[PDB]
Design an enzyme around this catalytic site. Structure first.
Site, PDB file in Angstrom:
ATOM      1  CB  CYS B 127      -8.297  12.759  31.490  1.00 18.66           C
ATOM      2  SG  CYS B 127      -6.535  13.280  31.597  1.00 18.66           S
ATOM      3  CB  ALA B 159      -4.789   3.647  34.312  1.00 19.38           C
ATOM      4  N   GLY B 162       0.533   7.741  37.905  1.00 23.53           N
ATOM      5  CA  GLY B 162      -0.072   8.891  38.595  1.00 23.53           C
ATOM      6  C   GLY B 162      -1.558   8.672  38.811  1.00 23.53           C
ATOM      7  CB  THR B 163      -4.060   7.367  36.346  1.00 27.25           C
ATOM      8  OG1 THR B 163      -4.105   8.471  35.421  1.00 27.25           O
ATOM      9  CG2 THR B 163      -5.416   6.673  36.352  1.00 27.25           C
ATOM     10  CG  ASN B 166      -2.343  10.476  42.963  1.00 28.09           C
ATOM     11  OD1 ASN B 166      -2.175  10.772  44.149  1.00 28.09           O
ATOM     12  ND2 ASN B 166      -1.323  10.392  42.088  1.00 28.09           N
ATOM     13  CG  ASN B 277      -6.997   8.150  29.613  1.00 32.06           C
ATOM     14  OD1 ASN B 277      -6.491   7.752  28.568  1.00 32.06           O
ATOM     15  ND2 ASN B 277      -6.595   7.728  30.803  1.00 32.06           N
TER      16      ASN B 277
HETATM   17  S1  COA Z   1      -5.517  11.566  31.277  1.00 36.73           S
HETATM   18  C1  COA Z   1      -5.123  10.988  32.952  1.00 36.73           C
HETATM   19  C2  COA Z   1      -3.908  11.753  33.452  1.00 36.73           C
HETATM   20  N1  COA Z   1      -3.592  11.431  34.847  1.00 36.73           N
HETATM   21  C3  COA Z   1      -3.714  12.271  35.876  1.00 36.73           C
HETATM   22  O1  COA Z   1      -4.188  13.403  35.780  1.00 36.73           O
HETATM   23  C4  COA Z   1      -3.306  11.770  37.258  1.00 36.73           C
HETATM   24  C5  COA Z   1      -2.039  12.435  37.775  1.00 36.73           C
HETATM   25  N2  COA Z   1      -0.921  12.305  36.844  1.00 36.73           N
HETATM   26  C6  COA Z   1       0.038  13.219  36.657  1.00 36.73           C
HETATM   27  O2  COA Z   1       0.209  14.203  37.390  1.00 36.73           O
HETATM   28  C7  COA Z   1       0.916  13.005  35.440  1.00 36.73           C
HETATM   29  O3  COA Z   1       2.330  13.074  35.758  1.00 36.73           O
HETATM   30  C8  COA Z   1       0.571  13.972  34.280  1.00 36.73           C
HETATM   31  C9  COA Z   1       0.920  15.432  34.595  1.00 36.73           C
HETATM   32  C10 COA Z   1      -0.913  13.851  33.961  1.00 36.73           C
HETATM   33  C11 COA Z   1       1.413  13.577  33.071  1.00 36.73           C
HETATM   34  O4  COA Z   1       1.030  12.270  32.627  1.00 36.73           O
HETATM   35  P1  COA Z   1       1.993  11.438  31.665  1.00 36.73           P
HETATM   36  O5  COA Z   1       1.291  10.124  31.433  1.00 36.73           O
HETATM   37  O6  COA Z   1       2.439  12.284  30.500  1.00 36.73           O
HETATM   38  O7  COA Z   1       3.269  11.186  32.606  1.00 36.73           O
HETATM   39  P2  COA Z   1       4.779  10.888  32.159  1.00 36.73           P
HETATM   40  O8  COA Z   1       5.481  10.355  33.380  1.00 36.73           O
HETATM   41  O9  COA Z   1       4.797  10.100  30.874  1.00 36.73           O
HETATM   42  O10 COA Z   1       5.389  12.321  31.790  1.00 36.73           O
HETATM   43  C12 COA Z   1       5.879  13.219  32.780  1.00 36.73           C
HETATM   44  C13 COA Z   1       7.114  13.844  32.158  1.00 36.73           C
HETATM   45  O11 COA Z   1       7.470  15.019  32.885  1.00 36.73           O
HETATM   46  C14 COA Z   1       8.878  14.932  33.131  1.00 36.73           C
HETATM   47  N3  COA Z   1       9.143  15.771  34.292  1.00 36.73           N
HETATM   48  C15 COA Z   1       8.904  15.496  35.589  1.00 36.73           C
HETATM   49  N4  COA Z   1       9.240  16.559  36.365  1.00 36.73           N
HETATM   50  C16 COA Z   1       9.677  17.530  35.541  1.00 36.73           C
HETATM   51  C17 COA Z   1      10.178  18.896  35.719  1.00 36.73           C
HETATM   52  N5  COA Z   1      10.268  19.454  36.946  1.00 36.73           N
HETATM   53  N6  COA Z   1      10.506  19.565  34.583  1.00 36.73           N
HETATM   54  C18 COA Z   1      10.426  19.033  33.339  1.00 36.73           C
HETATM   55  N7  COA Z   1       9.984  17.775  33.108  1.00 36.73           N
HETATM   56  C19 COA Z   1       9.605  17.010  34.172  1.00 36.73           C
HETATM   57  C20 COA Z   1       9.128  13.454  33.326  1.00 36.73           C
HETATM   58  O12 COA Z   1      10.539  13.202  33.265  1.00 36.73           O
HETATM   59  C21 COA Z   1       8.319  12.898  32.176  1.00 36.73           C
HETATM   60  O13 COA Z   1       8.975  13.082  30.914  1.00 36.73           O
HETATM   61  P3  COA Z   1      10.007  12.015  30.235  1.00 36.73           P
HETATM   62  O14 COA Z   1      10.897  12.865  29.363  1.00 36.73           O
HETATM   63  O15 COA Z   1       9.146  11.049  29.440  1.00 36.73           O
HETATM   64  O16 COA Z   1      10.680  11.382  31.433  1.00 36.73           O
HETATM   65 NA    NA Z   2      -8.224   8.966  33.362  1.00 38.07          NA
END
Ligand code: COA
Ligand code: NA
Ligand code: COA
Ligand code: MG
Ligand code: MG
Ligand code: NA
Ligand code: NA
Ligand code: NA
Lengths: 334, 295, 335, 293
Positions: B127, B159, B162-163, B166, B277
Site C-alpha cells: 500500500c 493497520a 497482517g500489517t 509482517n 492505505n
Molecule cells: S493497505 C495494507 C494491507 N496490508 C498488507 O499488505 C499486509 C498483509 N496483509 C494481507 O495479506 C491481508 O490479508 C490483505 C490481503 C492485504 C487483505 O487485507 P484485509 O484488511 O482486507 O484483510 P481481511 O482479513 O479483512 O480480509 C481477508 C478476507 O479474505 C477471506 N479469505 C481468506 N482466505 C480466503 C480464501 N482462500 N478464499 C476466499 N476468501 C478468503 C477472509 O475470510 C476475509 O474475508 P471475510 O469475509 O471478511 O472473512
Molecule cells: Na500500510
C-alpha cells in the site's frame, strides 16, 4: 535492598545529541570507561535503533554495525545492547548486530503498538539474546492501557518492559502509577524498567521513584548525553542510588571520572533544558525531534520552540521527524 | 477496448469490500462475483445488497460457474493467492493480486503497467509502495536517484493483523520496489503507526537523493504531473506543499535531496477516509484492472 | 492552594556570577520576571547583605545600589534581600529597607535559629514581610528542624524554609522535613523549600515540598545559582502548570526571560559536573564551588577532592576559608 | 614585692576560668570572687579553692578592709558600666572582659604598653584577641588598606550573650581591627558550627597588602607574633604558612595575605573547644600580669 541494573545509553540515546557522528575512538573510549566503572549493559546503536541511518533521522558517519563491533571488542565485562524499532529496523538488522556480538536486544514500539514487535522478540530469544521491551512516549496512555501492552511484549518473549518517558513529560506520581501497573501485570515473570529524559529536570527523581515502586532496570547516559535536554545522568544515578543504599555495582568515583574526563570533552554542547527542550517536556514531544527542529528553524527562518509547540499540538509519535518540515513550511508562510 | 470486463473478487474483507464499491463505479469493470469462505461474512452480505452474486464456497465454486470472469482480484492472504494463482492461470482468468504472494510482476499503474499489460497475473506491491513509488519514478525519470527513502505514517486503526505481523516485510518489499519499479539505485522504507484520535489521514514523505545541479523546476513539474495522474484514481492524493530542495549535508553523506510531502485521504467508500492505505491499494488495483480491460 | 515562587537569579545567581552583576543585568532581569508575574525577586550578594568580602568575593556594584535599581524597575514584584546573621547586620537591613526592599529573608545554619532574633524583630518593625531560611537542612532530622523553625516563627518569621543548601536532600527527605515544619508552624506561618541541582533533584523536591504543604518555593532563571544551580524558575512554572497548581507566572514569559534575557549573560551554563555532584553527595554548601575551583588552580589539586574533604569535615555556610586550608593539605600530600 | 591582690566580679564561665588561670599566676593572688546569685557555681568553686566569695556584689567588695589592687569584671556591659566609676573612685585598676568599653581597647602583644598606667582597660572581643595580633603583625610591615577576619566557633561555645549580640561582634571587632590592628578598613564575620565533637576554634585573617610587598618579611612578622601569643595561649597555632595571592582584577590593585589559625583552649575550667572564652581569659590574665608589674 534489591539491586538495580543501570543500562547506559550514552552511545545510543546520546547518538541523537551527536547527530550520529560518533567516531570509533569515542565509542571505544566510552565503552572502556563505563565497563571499568562496573556498568553492566552499554547500549550502542544509531539513536533511532538499528537501521536508523536515513534521510529522515540522519545517517551515521561510521557504519552502524562497525560501531557495535568496536564496542563488543572493547568490552570486558559489560554486555552490549542494541535498540531496534519495528518499522525502521528489522530482524535482518538484529541478526547483523548479533553476529557482531551484541547480547541484549531492546525492542521499541510506540506505547500503543506492542503487537508489531512479536517477530523481533521471537528472533532475539532464538538468537540467545536477553530481551527488553520499550514502550515509547508512555505519557500518552494510562497505566492500565500501558500494562496491557507490556503483557503483549512479555508474551512475545520480553524479559523486561520499560516505561519510556521519550518526551521527558512524566511528573513523579505519573511514573509511579505506570511502573506499579506494569509490576502488577508482569512482575511475577519479567522485570520492569524506566527510561527518563531531562526536559523538565525530572529524569533522576522519576528513576528513583520507579525503583521504589518495583522497577529493577534504569537507563542513564554519561553527562546526560541524549535526546532533548538529555537523559538521566549515569553518574548522578550512581551517586544517588549509593546515597539511598541501593546497590548498582557501579563505582561512583569511576562514573564521575568517565563523565568528566572521557565524555565531557567530546560533547558538541552541554545537554541543557533550553526553551525548546522544556516545550518538548511540557507538550509531550518525542525528545529526538530537537536537533531536527533546530535544523528546520534555521532553514525556514522560524523559531524551533514554535515548531515543537505545533508538533506537540498535533500528537506525532517517534519517528515522525518528517512532520517537522511540513510544520516549519507552514510557520514560514504564516 | 470500450467494453466492460467481467470481474470476481476473492476475499470479501476490508480490501475486497472497498474494492467492490470502487469497481461498481468503474467505467470498464463489471463485478459479477464476490467469493469468500465464511458464510457470515460482512463482505458477502454487502455484495448481495449490491446485486452481486456472492458465495462462501470459495474458489472451487467460482471455477464451477458457467460464465467465468475475465478478471479476478484477490485480497485474501499470501498463502491463499499462492494456492489460487495457478488455478486462475489454468482457467485463463487474468489475476490482480492485492496480497504479498507476488507470483506476477510488481506493478504501479502510472509507472510500469504498460510493459506488463499482457501478463496473466500482476501484483500490487504494498500500500505504501502505491503511494510513494509514483513519486520516486517522477524524480528518477528526470535525474539519476542514487537513493530514495519513504516514510509512511498510518492511523493505527488502519493497520490490520497482517500489517502488524509482517512489518519487516513492508520495509523490505517496499525498498526493493523503490529500486525495481521506482528506478532508484538504493531504497529504504519506514513505517510508523500513530494512534491519534480521531484517526489520522495517511501521510507519506518521499526523499530522493539528486545531483546538486539538478533542474529542480523540471523535477517539480514532473512530480506535479505524477500527482495529478495518481489523483485521477485517488482524488484525495495531494501535495501538502511544493517539493523542498536542499543542497548536500554531512548528515546525509554528501547527498543533495528533494523531499515530497503527501497526504493520502481515502474516498470513504466502504472504509473510512483515514484508511488511506487500504483505499490507495484498492484504487490502484481498480486502475490496473481498468487498464488491463482497455488494452 | 496556590504556590508563590520567589526568584533568586539575582541573589543565589550572584554566586555563579562571582558577584559581578551590573545594574543593567539586574534591571533587565527584574523587568522580565515582573512582567512574567513573578511576585518576589531576591537581590543581594550571594552570601546576603554585607557579604562582599575577601571570604566570599567582593561585589562589582554595591548590592544596595542593585537593590535600589531592582525596586525602581519593579512594577508589581516585591524585592527581597537575604541576610545571614554573623555576616550581615540590622544596619545592613535598614539600608536595604531604605532602598525599598520589602521582604527580608534571614538565614541561619539549621541548628542556630536563635541568632536571628534581633533581625526578625527589626524586619517586622520596618514593616517587611519575613522569611526564615534554615540552611544545610539535610544536616539534622525533621523534628530537630521543626524546633528551629518554631524559634524563627516566635521571633517573627512569617514563613520558614527548608533550605537544601548542598543539593543533598533526596525526595522523601524533603517530604519528612516539610511535614514536620507544617505540623509545627503551619497554623501560624507558611513553609517553604529552596533546592539546588547538584543531584538533579531540585524540581522534584520542590513539587514534593508543595504536595506536603509548602506554599513558597524558590527558583532561578536558567538555574543560575550556586553549585549545579537552583531549581529553574521556568521549569517550576511549566511543571506546576502541568500539575494544575496556580503560580501566577506565565510559562511562555518565564521561558522567554530565561532564554532571551538571562542566558545571554551566563558566564557558563549551570551544570552538574563532577565537583557539583560531589557537593550533593557529600553535603557541601553549594556556594563553595567557584572558591574550590579557584583553590584547585592555585594549589594544583582537584576541586572535587577539595569538596569531598569539605563534606567529610562538616563545614557550614560561610566557611569558604576552610577550602584553602584543605587545598594546602592536599598539595602537601602529593609531596 | 609579692603578688598583686585581685578580685573577680562575675563568677560565670569566664570569671571561673579566669580564677583557675590566675591561681597559677606568680604575679596575682585572687582574694575575692564576687557575684549576685548565692546559688552560683563560680562562688562555690572559689570557696573550694580558699578564695573569699560573696553573692552580695560590688557593694560588699568595696566595704572590705583590704581593697584589691586589680579587679577583673566578667558580668555584662550594663554591670560594668555601673561598677566602673566605683572602681575608679576607690583606686582599683579594672580589667573589663565585657562589652562596656569604658577604658581603652587593649590587646597585649599589640598596644598594652601605651596603657600600663590606665585605670581601666577593655579586652575588646574574643575574636579580636585572636585576630588583632595578626593584623598588627602585617600592618607593622606594610600598609594594610583592608583587613577581614572570619571566626568559626563551636555552637556549644556560644552563650546567650554571644547569640543575642552577633551584630555587635561584627561591628566592634571590625572597628578594633582598624583602631588597634592598624588596618585602614576592617570587617569581621562569625560562624557557628554544631559539629560533634565540638570543633576547636578557627580564625582566618585576610589582609590587603601592596602587590610588591616583601612577603618573606610579612611571614616572619606573622610567625614572630604567633609565637608571642602562644606564650600566653599555648594552643594558638598556625595551621599552615601565610598564603599570598596576587591582585584579582576585582581587588583593584591590591594583593592578599591569608593567615589560618587554630585556637585550642588550655582546658582550665572550660573544655579545649571553648577557645573563644579561653583566649579572652588568657589575654586578660596577661594584661593583668603586666599591670601588676
Ligand atoms: S493497505 C495494507 C494491507 N496490508 C498488507 O499488505 C499486509 C498483509 N496483509 C494481507 O495479506 C491481508 O490479508 C490483505 C490481503 C492485504 C487483505 O487485507 P484485509 O484488511 O482486507 O484483510 P481481511 O482479513 O479483512 O480480509 C481477508 C478476507 O479474505 C477471506 N479469505 C481468506 N482466505 C480466503 C480464501 N482462500 N478464499 C476466499 N476468501 C478468503 C477472509 O475470510 C476475509 O474475508 P471475510 O469475509 O471478511 O472473512
Ligand atoms: Na500500510
Ligand atoms: S568569648 C565570647 C564572649 N561573649 C561576648 O563577649 C558577648 C557578650 N557577653 C557578655 O557580656 C558576657 O556576659 C561576658 C562578660 C562575656 C560573660 O560571659 P560568660 O559566658 O562568663 O557569662 P555567664 O553568664 O556565665 O557569667 C556572668 C556572671 O556574672 C554574674 N553577674 C551579672 N551581673 C553581675 C553584677 N552586677 N555583679 C556581679 N556579678 C554579676 C552572673 O550572675 C553570672 O554569674 P553566675 O554566678 O554564674 O550566675
Ligand atoms: Mg530516549
Ligand atoms: Mg541557595
Ligand atoms: Na506528582
Ligand atoms: Na499456499
Ligand atoms: Na566568640
Amino acid at each position: 535492598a534489591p539491586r538495580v541494573r543501570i543500562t547506559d545509553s550514552t552511545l545510543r540515546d546520546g547518538s541523537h545529541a551527536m547527530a550520529h557522528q560518533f567516531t570509533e575512538e569515542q565509542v571505544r573510549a566510552t565503552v572502556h570507561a563505563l565497563d571499568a566503572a562496573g556498568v553492566e549493559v552499554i547500549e550502542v546503536s544509531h539513536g533511532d535503533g538499528l537501521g536508523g541511518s536515513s534521510f529522515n533521522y540522519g545517517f551515521s558517519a561510521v557504519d552502524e554495525i562497525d560501531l557495535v563491533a568496536a564496542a563488543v571488542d572493547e568490552a570486558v565485562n559489560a554486555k552490549i545492547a542494541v535498540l531496534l524499532l519495528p518499522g525502521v529496523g528489522t530482524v535482518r538488522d538484529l541478526k547483523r548486530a548479533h553476529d557482531a556480538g551484541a547480547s541484549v536486544a531492546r525492542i521499541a514500539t510506540h506505547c500503543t503498538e506492542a503487537d508489531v514487535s512479536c517477530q523481533h522478540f521471537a528472533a532475539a530469544r532464538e538468537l540467545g539474546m536477553e530481551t527488553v521491551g520499550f514502550l515509547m512516549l508512555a505519557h500518552r496512555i494510562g497505566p492500565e492501557e500501558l500494562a496491557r501492552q507490556a503483557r503483549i511484549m512479555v508474551d512475545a518473549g520480553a524479559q523486561c518492559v520499560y516505561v519510556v518517558d521519550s518526551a521527558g513529560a512524566l511528573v513523579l506520581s505519573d511514573v509511579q502509577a505506570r511502573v506499579q501497573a506494569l509490576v502488577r501485570e508482569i512482575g511475577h515473570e519479567a522485570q520492569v524498567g524506566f527510561h527518563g529524559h531531562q526536559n523538565l529536570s525530572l529524569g533522576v527523581a522519576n528513576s528513583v521513584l520507579a525503583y521504589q515502586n518495583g522497577a529493577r532496570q534504569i537507563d542513564g547516559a554519561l553527562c546526560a548525553l541524549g535526546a532533548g535536554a538529555g537523559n538521566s545522568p549515569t553518574e548522578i544515578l550512581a551517586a544517588t542510588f549509593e546515597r539511598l543504599n541501593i546497590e548498582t555495582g557501579v563505582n561512583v568515583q569511576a562514573a564521575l571520572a568517565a563523565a568528566e574526563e572521557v565524555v565531557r570533552p567530546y560533547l558538541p554542547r552541554l545537554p541543557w533544558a533550553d526553551r525548546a527542550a522544556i516545550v518538548q517536556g511540557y507538550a509531550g514531544v518525542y525528545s529526538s525531534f530537537l536537533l531536527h527542529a533546530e535544523r528546520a528553524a534555521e532553514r525556514y527562518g522560524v523559531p524551533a520552540h514554535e515548531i515543537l509547540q505545533r508538533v506537540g499540538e498535533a500528537g506525532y509519535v517517534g519517528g515522525q521527524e518528517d512532520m517537522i518540515i511540513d510544520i516549519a513550511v507552514q510557520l514560514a508562510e504564516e | 477496448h470500450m467494453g466492460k470486463a467481467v470481474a470476481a473478487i476473492v476475499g470479501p474483507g476490508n480490501i475486497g469490500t472497498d474494492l467492490l464499491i470502487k469497481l461498481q463505479r468503474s467505467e470498464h469493470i463489471e463485478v459479477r462475483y464476490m467469493v469468500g469462505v465464511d458464510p457470515a461474512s460482512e463482505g458477502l452480505a454487502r455484495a448481495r445488497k449490491l446485486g452481486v452474486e456472492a458465495s462462501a464456497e470459495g474458489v472451487d465454486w467460482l471455477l464451477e460457474q458457467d460464465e467465468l470472469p475475465d478478471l479476478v482480484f484477490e485480497a485474501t492472504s499470501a498463502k491463499a493467492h499462492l494456492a489460487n494463482a495457478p488455478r486462475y492461470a489454468e482457467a485463463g482468468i487474468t489475476a490482480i493480486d492485492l496480497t504479498p504472494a507476488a507470483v506476477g510482476p510488481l506493478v504501479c499503474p502510472p509507472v510500469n503497467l504498460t510493459e506488463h499489460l499482457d501478463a496473466p497475473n500482476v501484483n500490487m506491491i504494498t500500500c505504501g509502495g502505491q503511494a510513494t513509488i509514483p513519486i520516486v519514478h517522477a524524480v528518477s525519470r528526470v535525474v539519476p536517484v542514487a537513493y530514495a527513502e519513504i516514510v509512511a505514517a498510518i492511523a493505527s486503526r488502519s493497520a490490520g493483523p497482517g500489517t502488524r505481523a509482517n512489518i519487516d516485510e513492508f520495509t523490505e518489499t517496499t525498498a526493493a520496489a523503490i529500486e525495481q519499479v521506482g528506478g532508484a539505485a538504493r531504497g529504504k522504507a519506514i513505517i510508523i503507526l500513530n494512534p491519534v484520535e480521531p484517526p489520522m489521514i495517511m501521510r507519506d514523505t518521499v526523499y530522493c537523493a539528486i545531483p546538486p545541479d539538478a533542474d529542480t523546476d523540471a523535477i517539480t513539474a514532473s512530480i506535479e504531473e505524477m500527482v495529478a495522474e495518481v489523483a485521477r484514481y485517488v482524488p484525495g492524493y495531494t501535495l501538502r506543499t511544493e517539493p523542498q530542495y536542499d543542497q548536500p549535508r554531512d548528515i546525509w553523506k554528501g547527498m543533495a535531496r528533494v523531499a515530497v510531502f503527501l497526504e493520502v485521504r481515502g474516498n470513504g467508500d466502504y472504509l473510512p477516509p483515514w484508511a488511506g492505505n487500504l483505499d490507495i491499494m484498492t484504487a490502484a488495483a481498480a486502475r490496473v484492472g481498468e487498464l488491463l480491460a482497455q488494452a
